[PDB]
Design a protein around this ligand. Structure first.
Ligand SMILES: Cc1cc2nc3c(=O)[nH]c(=O)nc-3n(C[C@H](O)[C@H](O)[C@H](O)COP(=O)(O)OP(=O)(O)OC[C@H]3O[C@@H](n4cnc5c(N)ncnc54)[C@H](O)[C@@H]3O)c2cc1C
Ligand SMILES: Cc1cc2nc3c(=O)[nH]c(=O)nc-3n(C[C@H](O)[C@H](O)[C@H](O)COP(=O)(O)OP(=O)(O)OC[C@H]3O[C@@H](n4cnc5c(N)ncnc54)[C@H](O)[C@@H]3O)c2cc1C
Lengths: 489, 489
C-alpha cells in the first residue's frame, strides 16, 4: 500500500486537504497532471470563513500584509456585511494563483508528497483498497491506497472513473473573460446592461483590466483551449461599441452556466471534494471558498478513519454535512448570476431586492450566505444558537500568557474549553485527552453579551465547528466525544 | 360649459372617479365608447386597500356575501399576509365585470351622467376651459368643460390628444389567456415550468377554466381583435402535450409585457388616471386596484378646485402623490411577473426569495407592497408612524350609538377626530366645519397598544389618509387644514 490516501489534483481543494490530512497524522500523495501551476488567477480574494479556516492553521502570515472590507454585494446589490455580528466580505485582492501558491508551500511544509506531471487515467475500488492507473514522467504506473479523493476539478476523471452520479444541467450560455493590457477601459464592478446583453470590468493593479462579456444569445460550446483573443474582442465591440483590437491579452478563456452536483459525496472508498462534486456558474465568488471548506470538513475526519481512531461512521458525516452546503452553493450562485447577468429585464427584481436588503434581517442573511458564516451542522437537538456553527475568534487567558480560540486549533485536534473550572468535565474527557486538547482558560475581551456568555464548556471539532456546549445540549459530553473522535481510550 | 368635469372611459377608474366627483358636490359626464359592458372579466378579486376604499363609501354590501383570505403570494411564492398588523390578501373571486357592474350602478346612484356609445376623437385645452370632439349615436358633437380626465385605458385617446409623454418600453413577449369549457385541465395556481416556457391554470367555478400560456420566444404583435382560439390551443399542445381542440372558448385574448408611465399626471387642465397613466405586465393583480385608487386620490381634490373651495395647488398633489405609486406599480408588477414567468432559470432566485419571505420584516414588506397598505404620502416632516398613511378601521363611541372610522368617511368630507375632548382643537377648526366633519368620540375595541394609543386628535383627508396627528406633527392644525381644504372661512 504505497500511501494511506491518494489525492488527485493539486488545486485549492487538493492542497488544502493534503495539509489537513498530514496534520491528522497521515501520509498522503497528491497527483497533479500539470507540471507547473496554471498562471491563470480566476477568483480575486476569499470569504470570511475561508479567511478563518486558513487562520485556524497559521497560514495567513504567508500571504503578506492584507486587507478586509465590509462593503460587498449580493449579485451586484451593495450589502453592508457589518449588520451580522462579526462578519465581513473577505480579503480583497488576492488572486487564486497566489492562494494556490500559498497552499502548495504549506502542505509541502506539512510533509505531503506532491507528484507533478502525473495524470490519473483509471481506478478500481477492490473492497479493502483502491488501485490507481497513472501516466507520469517515466511512464505508466499502478498504485495502491486505502482511500482516493477526487480533487481533479470540474471535469473530474476520478468522478467518472469511480462511477459517480452527476445530475444537473449542462451549460446554456457562453460568456467570455479576458485580462487585457494597453486599452483604456472603463470600470464596471456591478457590470452594465447594454441592449445586446451585459458587460463587466474592473482594474487589477499593474496595467491589467478584467473584462467579462455576456452576448445574450451565445450558445454553449465545448472547445479545445481558450477562444482566440480577436473573437472575444469582436464580441466586446458588438456589445460596447469599443474596438479592442490593439489589446495585448494575458489570459483569455470561455466559461458557462452549468448546475450539477454528485448525488453522493462518497462511494465505497472513493470521495470527491471541490469542483469535482459541484459545478456551477462562477458568480459571487464561491467556487474556491466552498471547495477549500469541503477539504476542511473531510481532512480530519478521514485522518481519523484511516488510522483506526474513528469508526467509519464518522466519514459519512462528510457527505451529510456537505452535500447540503454544495447544494446551497448551486442555489446561491445561480441566483446571484441571474441578477448580475440579465437585461433591463431583471431590473424590477433587483429593485425589490435593494428594498429588502435595507432591513437588518435580510442584510444579515445574505451576508451570512455569501461569507459562509451561516453554516450550522446537525450535531444535537438542543436549544443553544452556537451548536453546530463555527467557533468565533475569541482571545483567552491561559496560565502564563494569552492565546486565542483560533490558535488552539493550529494542531487540528479537538478543543475542549473549560472556562468555569469544572474538574467534572475534564474527567469525563480524560479518555480522549489523546485526541482532544483539554484547555482551561477565561475569556479576555468578550462583548459582555456575546455567544460565550453563560457558557461553562465547549467542544470544538478540528474544523473549528462546535459539537457540544454546556449548557443546552441533549447529549452529555461522553456521547459527543464518541460521536466525533471515537471510542473512549 | 356643458359639465364641470368630463371623464372619458367608464371602466373601474372612470366609474370610481365619477362617483367620487359627485360626492365632492360636482356634476360630471362620463363618455364611454362601448354601448354595453365588455363581458370579459380579466382580474379576479381585489386588494385590501381597494376593499377599504369601497367600504369608505358604503359600496361593499352591493357585492353580495364575500370572503377574504390571508394566504396569498408574491410572484408565486406563498406569503402569509397576516404578519403585517391588520392586513390580508383581498376579496377572493370577484370578476372585474362584476366590480365594473357594481361601480357603474353606484355612480349612477350618485347622480353621475353616463353617455354610452360616445367616442372621444380629439380635444383642445383653450386655457380657461377644454373642448372635446365626440362621435356619438346621433353623430359628432362638441362639448365644453373645465376639466377632462383621461380614464380611457392602455391606449388612451386622451393622453395622445392632450400631448402627454409616455416613456417606457413597449412589449417584448406575447402571452395568451383563454377561458375554456369542456376540457379536463389541471390546476396550476403557481403555474408550472415546461421546457418550452411556462403555463398556468385555475378553476373558476361553473364549468370554466382559465389557462395562461407563455411560449418563450413569442414576439410581440399588434393585432385586430383577439387571437383565433385554435391558435392558442395549438400553443397549449406545443407546450403541455395536451390537445384542447375540443374546447369551447368563452373569452380569448393576447396580452404583453410593456412598461410605460406618463411623466406628468396633469397638463394644464387635462388629467389621467388608471391604465392611461401607467401600463404594465398584468401580474400580481394590480392594474384595477392601483387605478381605482388613483381615482380616489384625485376625485375629492378635483371637486375642491372645480368649485373654488381649494387653490389649484391642491390638485398638483394628485401628481406628486401618485406618480410614485404608479412607478412602484411598474416595479412591483414586472418583478412579480419575471419570477412567475421564467424558466427553470429563475428557480434559484425564487429559492432565495422563499428563504427571505420566512422572516417577519420581509413577509410584511411584500404583503404591504401587494395590498397597497404601505402607502405613506408626504404630509409633514414629523415623527409619528401613521402620518400620511391610511386610517385603519376602528370602531368609535359616539354620543348615542357606536360608529366607525370607516363610516364617517361615507360623505367624503374630511374627518377631524377629537378623542381627548379638547375644545381648543374644535375651535381652530371651526373655520372649516363646512368642509371637515368635527367628530368627538372615544375608541371602542382598540388593541391596547395600537396606532391610536396616546392620540388626542387626527385629521383624515376625504380619501381616508391621515394628514395631521396630535401629537407629533411639525405643523399646527391651521397650516394642515389650509393645505388640504383651502383657506379659513
Ligand atoms: C471565471 C472564473 C472566476 C472565478 N472566480 C471565483 C471567485 O472569485 N471566488 C471563488 O471562490 N471561486 C471562483 N471561481 C471558481 C474556482 O476557480 C473553482 O472553484 C476552483 O478554482 C476549483 O477548485 P478545485 O481545487 O476543486 O479544482 P481545480 O482548481 O479545477 O483543480 C483541479 C486540479 O486537478 C487536476 N486534474 C484534473 N484531472 C486530473 C487527472 N486526471 N489527474 C491528475 N490531475 C488532474 C488539474 O490539473 C487541476 O489542477 C472562479 C472560476 C472561474 C472559471
Ligand atoms: C390578463 C389580464 C388580467 C388582469 N388581472 C388583474 C387583476 O387580477 N387585478 C387587478 O387589479 N388588475 C388586473 N388587470 C389589469 C386591469 O384589468 C386594468 O388595470 C383595468 O381593468 C383598467 O383600468 P381603467 O379603468 O383605467 O381602464 P379600462 O378598464 O381599460 O377602461 C377604459 C375604458 O375607456 C374606454 N375608452 C377608451 N378610449 C376611449 C375613447 N376614445 N372614447 C371613449 N371611451 C374610451 C374603453 O371603452 C374602456 O371601457 C388585468 C389585466 C389583464 C389584461
Amino acid at each position: 500500500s504505497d500511501a494511506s490516501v491518494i489525492v488527485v489534483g493539486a488545486g485549492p481543494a487538493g492542497l488544502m486537504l493534503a495539509g489537513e490530512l498530514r496534520l491528522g497524522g497521515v501520509d498522503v500523495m497528491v497527483l497533479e497532471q500539470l507540471p507547473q501551476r496554471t498562471g491563470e488567477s480566476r477568483g480575486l480574494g476569499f470569504t470570511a470563513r475561508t479567511m478563518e479556516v486558513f487562520d485556524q492553521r497559521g497560514i495567513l502570515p504567508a500571504f503578506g500584509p492584507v486587507e478586509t472590507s465590509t462593503q460587498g454585494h449580493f449579485g451586484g446589490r451593495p450589502v453592508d456585511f457589518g449588520v451580522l455580528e462579526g462578519a465581513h466580505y473577505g480579503v480583497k485582492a488576492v488572486p487564486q494563483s497566489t492562494t494556490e501558491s500559498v497552499l502548495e508551500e504549506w502542505a509541502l511544509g506539512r510533509g505531503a508528497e506532491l507528484l507533478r506531471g502525473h495524470t490519473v487515467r483509471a481506478l478500481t475500488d477492490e473492497g479493502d483498497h483502491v488501485v490507481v492507473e497513472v501516466e507520469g514522467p517515466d511512464g505508466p504506473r499502478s498504485l495502491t491506497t486505502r482511500y482516493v479523493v477526487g480533487c481533479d476539478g470540474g471535469r473530474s476523471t476520478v468522478r467518472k472513473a469511480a462511477g459517480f452520479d452527476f445530475p444537473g444541467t449542462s451549460a446554456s450560455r457562453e460568456m467570455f473573460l479576458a485580462d487585457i493590457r494597453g486599452c483604456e477601459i472603463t470600470p464596471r464592478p456591478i457590470g452594465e446592461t447594454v441592449p445586446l446583453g451585459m458587460v463587466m470590468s474592473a482594474p487589477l493593479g499593474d496595467g491589467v483590466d478584467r473584462i467579462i462579456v455576456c452576448e445574450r444569445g451565445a450558445p454553449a460550446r465545448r472547445r479545445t483551449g481558450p477562444p482566440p483573443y480577436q473573437e472575444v474582442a469582436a464580441a466586446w465591440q458588438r456589445l460596447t461599441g469599443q474596438d479592442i483590437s490593439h489589446g495585448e491579452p494575458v489570459w483569455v478563456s470561455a466559461f458557462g452556466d452549468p448546475a450539477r452536483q454528485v448525488s453522493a459525496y462518497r462511494r465505497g472508498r472513493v470521495l470527491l471534494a471541490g469542483d469535482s462534486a459541484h459545478v456551477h456558474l462562477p458568480a459571487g465568488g464561491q467556487g474556491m471558498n466552498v471547495s477549500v471548506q469541503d477539504s476542511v470538513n473531510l481532512g480530519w475526519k478521514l485522518a481519523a478513519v484511516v488510522s483506526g481512531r474513528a469508526p467509519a461512521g464518522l466519514l459519512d458525516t462528510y457527505h451529510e454535512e456537505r452535500h447540503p452546503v454544495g447544494r446551497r452553493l448551486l442555489m446561491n450562485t445561480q441566483a446571484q448570476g441571474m441578477l448580475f447577468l440579465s437585461g433591463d429585464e431583471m431590473q424590477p427584481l433587483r429593485d425589490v431586492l435593494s428594498e429588502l436588503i435595507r432591513y437588518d434581517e435580510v442584510s444579515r442573511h445574505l451576508a451570512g450566505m455569501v461569507s459562509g458564516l451561516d453554516i450550522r451542522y446537525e450535531v444535537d437537538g438542543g436549544d443553544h444558537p452556537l451548536l453546530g456553527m463555527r467557533m468565533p475568534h475569541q482571545e483567552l487567558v491561559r496560565a502564563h500568557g494569552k492565546t486565542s480560540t483560533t490558535e488552539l486549533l493550529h494542531p487540528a485536534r479537538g478543543v475542549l474549553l473549560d472556562i468555569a473550572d469544572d474538574a467534572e468535565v475534564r474527567e469525563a474527557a480524560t479518555g480522549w485527552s489523546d485526541r482532544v486538547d483539554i484547555v482551561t482558560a477565561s475569556l479576555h475581551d468578550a462583548p459582555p453579551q456575546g455567544p460565550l456568555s453563560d457558557a461553562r464548556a465547549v467542544l470544538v471539532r478540528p474544523d473549528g465547528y462546535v459539537a457540544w456546549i454546556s449548557p443546552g445540549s441533549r447529549a452529555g459530553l461522553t456521547e459527543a466525544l464518541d460521536r466525533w473522535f471515537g471510542p473512549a481510550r
